Structures are given as structure tokens and as C-alpha cells.
DNA sequence: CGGCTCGAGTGTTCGATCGCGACTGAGGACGAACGCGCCCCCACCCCCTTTTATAGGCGCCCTTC
């Protein structure tokens, strides 16, 4: 959540979006779903998987350039995260995709 | 065969010249104390390599669009 502010803030996603992805993220870990991912790398798949559950959609390379990260170390971030994708968002939200329509990498 | 009035030549201070040097200040050039920085040396301590075990991050290539 540290770093939700200034990156979220770098993609000027709304509060809303930036807010969902923490949640997405603190759920996430307090389930331990992605033992091995480095948080901020988590971090930014639960943004891309926040901004791809809003119109501010972006491209994984640009949040990879944006985090430093791998694009791959994403994806497989990504990939661990896709599974409860549906459930990880909080309960205050409102989607732009269905989590059903949630893209696959 | 005696006095007495020139002219000529020499010596000693003193008046009259007068060029030179001393005294003082300003200007110009050079030097020394002061000064700056680099280069050199000593001192102190890191750098490289391998093996075995783990795991997260990641770069490159091959293929397809």
C-alpha cells in the first residue's frame, strides 16, 4: 500500500482504482497467495488487475516500466493472483470488466 | 749736479662668476615572501575463485504475426 499512492498516482488512476488494488493486494497476502513474489511485484499485478478491472486499462509493459519489474515476473504474478481474481476485489466496487472477462497471460 | 714725474713688471687679497652637486619627491621596474595545486609516496585494507544448496529475478533466442 506504500507504493499504491505514487505509481497508482504515476498511472493518475482514481483513488477508487487505487484503493481496490489494496485491498486486492492486502487480501491477497493475507492469504499468502503468491509466497515467493516480491510484494511490489504482486503489488503491481493487483494494479493491473485493479486498472483491467476499470477503463484505465494499461499494458503490462507499461506497469513493468513503471515498477522496474519483468514483464514475465508480472505475468507469472499475474498468474498467481488470476485464480481468486473475482474474489480479491473488496466488496465496494464497481467493475468495466467482468472478472469472467479478466484477460489471461 | 739733484729732485721729481712716467711706464713696466710682479705680488696678494678680494670682488665677481658660475658651473656642479647635494637634497627631496615621484615614477618605473624588479624581487621576495606569500601562495596554490599537483604529483609522489606510504599506509591501510579490499578484490578475485570455487563448491554446495535455494529461490527469485531476468536476458536472450526462436517463432509467429
Redesign the pocket.
Known sequence: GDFMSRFCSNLCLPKQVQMAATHIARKAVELDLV????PI?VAAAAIYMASQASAEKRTQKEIGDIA???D??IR??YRLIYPRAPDLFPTDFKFDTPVDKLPQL
Open positions: 509466497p515467493g513474489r516480491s511485484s522496474g519489474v519483468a514475465v515476473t507469472q504474478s
